Structures are given as structure tokens and as C-alpha cells.
Amino acid sequence: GSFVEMVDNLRGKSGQGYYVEMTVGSPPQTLNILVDTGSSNFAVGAAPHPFLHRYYQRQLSSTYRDLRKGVYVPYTQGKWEGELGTDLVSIPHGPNVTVRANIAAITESDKFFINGSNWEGILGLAYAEIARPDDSLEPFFDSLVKQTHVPNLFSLQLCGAGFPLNQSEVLASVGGSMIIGGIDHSLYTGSLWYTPIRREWYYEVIIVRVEINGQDLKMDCKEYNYDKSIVDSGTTNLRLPKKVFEAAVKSIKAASSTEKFPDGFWLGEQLVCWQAGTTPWNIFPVISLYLMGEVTNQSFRITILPQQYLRPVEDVATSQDDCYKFAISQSSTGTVMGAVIMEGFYVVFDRARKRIGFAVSACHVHDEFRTAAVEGPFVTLDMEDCGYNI
Amino acid sequence: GSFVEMVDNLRGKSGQGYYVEMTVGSPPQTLNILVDTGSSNFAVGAAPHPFLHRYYQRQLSSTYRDLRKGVYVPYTQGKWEGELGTDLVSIPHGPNVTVRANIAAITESDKFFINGSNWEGILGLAYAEIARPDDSLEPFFDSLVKQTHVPNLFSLQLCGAGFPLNQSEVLASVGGSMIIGGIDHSLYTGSLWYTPIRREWYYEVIIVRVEINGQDLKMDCKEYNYDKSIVDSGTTNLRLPKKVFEAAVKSIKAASSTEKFPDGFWLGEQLVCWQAGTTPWNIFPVISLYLMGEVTNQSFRITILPQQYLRPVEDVATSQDDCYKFAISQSSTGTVMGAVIMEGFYVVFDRARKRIGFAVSACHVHDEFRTAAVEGPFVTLDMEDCGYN
Ligand SMILES: CCCN(CCC)C(=O)c1cc(C)cc(C(=O)N[C@@H](Cc2cc(F)cc(F)c2)[C@H](O)[C@H]2CN(S(=O)(=O)c3ccccc3)CCN2)c1
Ligand SMILES: CCCN(CCC)C(=O)c1cc(C)cc(C(=O)N[C@@H](Cc2cc(F)cc(F)c2)[C@H](O)[C@H]2CN(S(=O)(=O)c3ccccc3)CCN2)c1
């Protein structure tokens, strides 16, 4: 590990998002910011809200600059509207630099902030193409790289605990690491395999094959990326295109058929519980996603365990049972490799070389019989045809 | 002799299938159903789908009965997942009867429904042996015959237009006729010749000889029926076993050599166009399929024209050119006499006498020089050897 100052600088969990501490303004105002590779706007609460115990106060910052322009950003989930401006920003547990970046001061929001999440803003790490209102609003990471000598690359190690974390616990627990400008070798085991970033807007990738316990889902690979596949820390679940979701669920059900679970479970709505320590991990299948490699006709795969796709939750009776929710759901906007998937790996967003790396995470949850994996190479043809075109 | 209430009750085209109107439930829910002699399950969309503008709503039918069982049916083309049940079914332009039949309520599907086809379900008319999940699930036609006095027989007259039919046109045009329980003499000319239904699962038949412009393809006749030969309205093209397909294409290319076409054409993937009205039908050969007759050592033949095996399609430029696709393709599951072949004839599915009849269709496309034909008899020996085991 060569970036000890940034190791363990994240907190949170898959269900409420992982955040990093930042400061904005002069004097610096400390705020917790959700790490989101699924959007491109840096925005912070700038007015009172029931779920916020603090927010950005522009009138108290001598370096605040008003851009005299409003902005409205609706996400799948919720939305917010705010006022654009710029100010000096820093990351206490990050590179030792300060940069002037665009900041959307959130004045109104609907279903955006999460009660008890402990974060007050969002850091969109994706590209300018999807920044609102348009690509002229330079994203934070672009500002960071342009104004400093920090390498154009960041890596994320999201650490799920493997069990429920109450309010106090989630506040004291280390949730992972965000290495700004590099790769810390202590955060993973095995080798790093890279898949190309198909296009620079979302961190889009191309999945070329899918297996459930080694069994090929056998769908036209184009289906896996319809209408796109992205790596998104700003989303809890692994979301899959309708048809892929239906096929996957059918296969996962078949593999775990020794136990019958209610429809609400597979819909990702209701939890299932087992007596403390008896979760039958072994009856659930591993899931392998093959991704396009950097070399022609070459692919590699990442394999996740049920310890990744079954999200730990507290029982409604807060009993001593171990409960979870099925963390895979359908999408109508392409595949979304959310936080529960990222929790099994150390993910390297290599913007400089337009590629994303994957390696088994040193903090992924597993059992004595199975482990997550990143293996290769495999001979795969016509992978370009797996990519979708509107 | 004539069934005016059923004449012209079909709509559609070879490329998207021919369908008949049906009603399910109480009160009646009208749906357009694909006529398919190549499968044995009656199934209808029962949940929203981008290609459907209507579907079966079980909660609105007082006569709906839940069988509490799912059913999964994968076809060559696509597939659907459904829930089994029964309900009262009728055919507005068919026999004046109501039947309680098995219905698979399609809840999920992959490449099954066709955008713009106008049908929302499928009517598998083949036998129980190939019904899913197993042969205990009585096919619609079996229920029909068992619950009513309708004769155990139906006949199909699929009418290809000979040219492309746009969206509005195909919706207003008469696609043909499905006569349930009888034979309408106005739908064909000449005599009806019958070939035996080898076995009751698919409507399986035995081809004993193949000719391209009179020239014998000269293959072991067992190759023509490997691993089976069926009459399937649920498939567009004439599909032939790999080895037969390769020999047939070579012969058809040789016969039409005065003009060269790209490989994509012979692969049935790309169209070929000619200035309006100039399609060189005459350079293309007729295709004759000899079928086993009902009399020992006797056979008859049905002759198809390029007007049948070249499927009319609209040019990408919507120009005034007359374009087509080669409607003959390779198969790995035996010969499939699809819609384009059926369009040249009136086909009688005589279940009661376990045989299929063919007669020149009153609506087949042709030109002033050639016509489709059904002629016989011919002396053919060891025809049983042509069947695959
Ligand atoms: C239920 C509470 C939220 N959580 C748990 C905590 C993480 C989810 O699991 C969850 C679930 C669903 C169905 C959607 C989202 C979502 O929208 N995430 C966005 C970030 C986010 C996090 C949050 F905490 C609350 C929010 F309001 C939003 C992410 O940037 C998407 C957004 N889109 S875009 O097309 O809208 C889009 C928006 C803006 C620009 C470009 C595209 C693309 C993929 N990247 C999040
Ligand atoms: C490209 C769109 C479809 N069209 C144009 C519209 C007609 C085709 O030209 C076409 C092309 C090919 C290569 C196959 C089929 C096909 O599977 N047809 C089945 C009906 C069908 C129609 C449709 F509209 C969409 C579909 F999903 C399916 C038919 O029941 C077969 C099925 N099999 S079985 O072995 O699977 C089989 C299935 C079930 C039980 C037993 C065997 C045997 C021969 N009878 C259709």
C-alpha cells in the first residue's frame, strides 16, 4: 500500500451508499459526500432539510462564487434542484490539494437525501457528457486533474460488513477506500484485469457472457448490454435488463430449488431470515460476468457470491436471526453493476487509459468453501457485437 | 361443399404469420391468434408487452379456471413462459360453438411476439404428443372435436399477395381461409391429392423425390425426411435439411445462372430488387416435391413457382422496385414446409382419415406462362424406406 493517507477513508453501506469526507468554502465547511460513479454533478445540501443535520452555507464562505444559474437534476430514485456556483474544495483524507470546483447548492429535493445515511451531498465521478445542465459544467474530478498533478485515475474498495450495522456501528465502522490518483496494492489479492471503457459518459463496459454456477445463461450477448452496462457505486443492486433479469432469476431459483422462497423475496421487496449462523450460502449459486478484455478476442470474468448479492438487513423483530434481501432487480435502462457487486472487488477507474480494472477485494465477504474471483483470459469472438447501438 | 361463414376469415402474410380472430373468457375478450400447424399449444399474451396493444385479462373472465401450473415453451424462433388454466373459447368466423379449452397465459417471452403482426396469441393445431408440458394437456382442436359435433378436420388456404402489403394494407386485406370441420370447393382448382400423415405428432409426411425444373436432385430419399418432414403454417420458409439445402441451392443457382446474386441473397438474409414489373421469374426454376400417395407404390407431386419461394418485401428505399427474399433456408430438424409453400395450395388437414390433401390454390400467385400444380399418380417403390427412424 502506497496511499495510506487515503486507505479506509470511506464509510456507509450498500443500502444507503458509501461516502467520503470533504470540505467546501473558506473557512472549510465539512460535509460527508456520497461517492457516485453513476452521475457527474457535485452537489450538496445548502438549505435545511429533515434528514440533514448540517449543510453548505454559502454566505459564510469568503471564496464562494455565484454562477447566477439554477439547475435541476432528476435521478431514477429522487431529485433535487439548486443553484450553481464555485468554491474551494478539499478532501481531508485524500490528496493534499485544494481545487476550485463547480458546486450545485441544493435548495429543494424529493426522495434524494436518505434518513440516517449520514451524507449531505453527492460526488458525481462520471464524465461531463452526462453532467447537468450540459457538458460545459466541468465535473469535480476533471477540475481536480486539471488544476493539480493528481493522476487521472481513482480506485474504489467498497466494504460490505457481511451483517447488519446499526446506527452507531455504521458511524464507527470503516466502509472502504477511495484512492484518488492511484492504486493501493493492499486493497486486493490476485491480479487486476482490465475491461475497456466503451465510451466516456457513464463508466460503460461490455459484458460478453453470463453464467450461474458455471451454467451459461445462453442469451445473445447484446441482451446483456441493452441498452448499456455501467459500473455504478450510486446504486445498491445489480440491476439487469428485463429479459436478462427474468432468465437470471429463473436460473438462480433453479440452482437454489432445495428451498422455496416467496415471490416478494425475488422481487427484492421482502427479506428472508435463518437462525443465527445457519444461512445456507451453499444452496445459492455464484454469478460470473465475463467482460471484454483489452486484448483482441480475449475476455476475463468476475465471479460474485450470494454473500454479495444477498444484502444483510436487520430483522423486523431485530431478533438474532440473520436476514437478507435479494439485491438483484430488473432495469429498463441497461445493466447496472451496483454497490453489492462492487463490494466483492477492488475497482480501478483508469480514466487515463480509458479502462476499468477488477481484482478480488481484500474485504469481500465469503465463506470457507468459496471466494469471489477475477480470472482470465478466455477466447471470446465478436465481442464488439455485444455492444448495443440505438 | 361451401362454408361461407368461414371463407376469408384469415389475415396476415408469410413473413409475420396468418391469424384468425378468437374470443376467450366471459364476457368475450377478442384476440387475433396465429394459426400454427407446427405446434400444439394454445397460448395468448396475458400481460403487457411492447408489441401487444391488447391481452388476455384473466381477472375479468368469470369463466376462467386456474390450473395452478406454469408452462415453459421454447420454439426454434422464440419462447414464452406462462400460467395454465382453462376458459370458454369461440371463433367468431368459425363453427357456431363454444369450447372450454386449455389456455397458457403468457406472462414472459423472448422473441416470440412480432412487432406489427397484429396477433396476440398462437393456436397450436398439431397433436398432443408434442404439447407442453406433456400430452395430458389437451390441444384446442382435440377439445373442439370432443365437445362438439364438428368433423375432425380443417383446411387452410393461405393467400400471399404477390407484392408487399404495408401496415394499413395488411390490416385491411383478406389473408385467406381456415375452414373448420370441412372443405370448401371454391378455394381450389383441379383435384385434391392426399399423402398419409406418417405419425400423429407434427403433421408429418414423407417426401420421396425432389426436382428442380424437372431435374432430379437425385439424393437418397431418406435425406429429404431427415429427421422428419412436416407441414407447418407457423414457419415462413421452406426449410430443408442441411445436405438437401446445399444440393438444392446449387441446382437453383445453376438454373438461374444468367444473373448473379450475392451470397447474402442465397442465405435468405438480403433482398434482391428489379425495376417495377421486371422480375425475371422465367430464369428461376420450379420446384417439385413428390409425396407418398395413399395407394401402394403410388406418389404424386406438388410444384412450386419462384412466385412462392421468393418472398415479396419492401425495399429499404420504399422505391417502386419489386424486391424479394429467398424463402428457402437450412434446417437441422428436418424439412419444414412453411407458409410460402402452403401459399401455393389449399391444404386439407384430414385428421379423421390421418392424411393431408393438396390442391392448387385459387389464390396462388403465378404468371401467364407457369402455374403451381398438384399432379399424379407416379409409380414409386420402397417409399417407406424414405422415412427416417
Ligand atoms: C432508494 C435509495 C437510493 N439507493 C440506495 C443508496 C445508493 C438505490 O439503490 C438506488 C436505486 C435506484 C432504482 C436508482 C438509484 C439512482 O438513481 N442512483 C443515482 C445516485 C443516487 C443515490 C441516492 F442515494 C439517491 C438518489 F436520488 C440518487 C445514480 O447516479 C444513477 C442515476 N442514473 S439516472 O439515469 O437517473 C442519471 C441521473 C443524472 C445524470 C445522468 C443519469 C444513472 C445511473 N446512476 C439509486
Ligand atoms: C422469425 C419470426 C417467426 N417466423 C415468421 C412468422 C411465422 C418464422 O418464419 C420462423 C422461423 C423459424 C426458424 C422458426 C419458427 C418457429 O419456431 N415456428 C413455430 C411457431 C412460432 C411462430 C412465431 F411467429 C414465433 C415463434 F417464436 C414461434 C412453430 O410452431 C415450429 C416450432 N418447432 S419447435 O421444434 O420449436 C417445437 C415447439 C413446440 C413443440 C414442439 C416443437 C417445430 C415446427 N413448428 C418460425
From Swiss-Prot, chain A:
**What is this enzyme's catalytic activity, as reactions?**
Broad endopeptidase specificity. Cleaves Glu-Val-Asn-Leu-|-Asp-Ala-Glu-Phe in the Swedish variant of Alzheimer's amyloid precursor protein
Positions of glycan attachment: 96, 115, 166, 297
Residue span(s) of domain Peptidase A1: 18-359
Activity regulation here? Inhibited by RTN3 and RTN4.
Superkingdom to which the source organism belongs: Eukaryota
Location of the protein in the cell: Cell membrane; Golgi apparatus, trans-Golgi network; Endoplasmic reticulum; Endosome
Broad EC category: hydrolase
| Molecular-function GO term, any one | beta-aspartyl-peptidase activity
Topology in the membrane?
A: Single-pass type I membrane protein
Give induction info: Up-regulated by the Ca(2+)-regulated transcription factor NFATC4.
Q: Which residues lie on this side of the membrane: Extracellular?
A: 1-390
- Per UniProt, which keywords does this protein have? Acetylation, Aspartyl protease, Cell membrane, Cell projection, Cytoplasmic vesicle, Disulfide bond, Endoplasmic reticulum, Endosome, Glycoprotein, Golgi apparatus, Hydrolase, Isopeptide bond, Lipoprotein, Lysosome, Membrane, Palmitate, Phosphoprotein, Protease, Signal, Transmembrane, Transmembrane helix, Ubl conjugation, Zymogen
Q: Does the keyword Membrane apply?
A: yes
Modification after translation, per record: N-Glycosylated. Addition of a bisecting N-acetylglucosamine by MGAT3 blocks lysosomal targeting, further degradation and is required for maintaining stability under stress conditions.
Quaternary structure? Monomer. Interacts with RTN1; RTN2; RTN3 and RTN4; the interaction leads to inhibition of amyloid precursor protein processing. Interacts with SNX6. Interacts with PCSK9. Interacts with NAT8 and NAT8B. Interacts with BIN1. Interacts (via extracellular domain) with ADAM10 (via extracellular domain). Interacts with SORL1; this interaction may affect binding with APP and hence reduce APP cleavage. Interacts with NRDC AND NRG1.
Q: What is this protein's name?
A: Beta-secretase 1
Identify the species of origin.
Homo sapiens (Human)
Q: Which residues of the full protein are shown?
A: 58 to 447 of 501
Curated annotation (Swiss-Prot), chain B:
Residues modified to N6-acetyllysine: 69, 218, 222, 228, 242-243, 250
Q: Name one GO biological process term.
A: amyloid-beta formation
Keywords, comma-separated and alphabetical: Acetylation, Aspartyl protease, Cell membrane, Cell projection, Cytoplasmic vesicle, Disulfide bond, Endoplasmic reticulum, Endosome, Glycoprotein, Golgi apparatus, Hydrolase, Isopeptide bond, Lipoprotein, Lysosome, Membrane, Palmitate, Phosphoprotein, Protease, Signal, Transmembrane, Transmembrane helix, Ubl conjugation, Zymogen
- Catalysis: reaction(s): Broad endopeptidase specificity. Cleaves Glu-Val-Asn-Leu-|-Asp-Ala-Glu-Phe in the Swedish variant of Alzheimer's amyloid precursor protein
- Give the glycosylated residues: 96, 115, 166, 297
Annotated membrane topology is:
Single-pass type I membrane protein
- Main localisation: membrane
Q: Which superkingdom is the protein from?
A: Eukaryota
Tissue specificity annotation: Expressed at high levels in the brain and pancreas. In the brain, expression is highest in the substantia nigra, locus coruleus and medulla oblongata.
| Post-translational modification summary for this protein | N-Glycosylated. Addition of a bisecting N-acetylglucosamine by MGAT3 blocks lysosomal targeting, further degradation and is required for maintaining stability under stress conditions.
Similarity annotation: Belongs to the peptidase A1 family.
Q: What is known of its domains?
A: DXXLL motif is required for a proper endocytosis and retrograde transport to the trans-Golgi network, as well as for regulation of lysosomal degradation.
Q: What is this protein called?
A: Beta-secretase 1
Which span of the entire protein is present here?
58 to 446 of 501
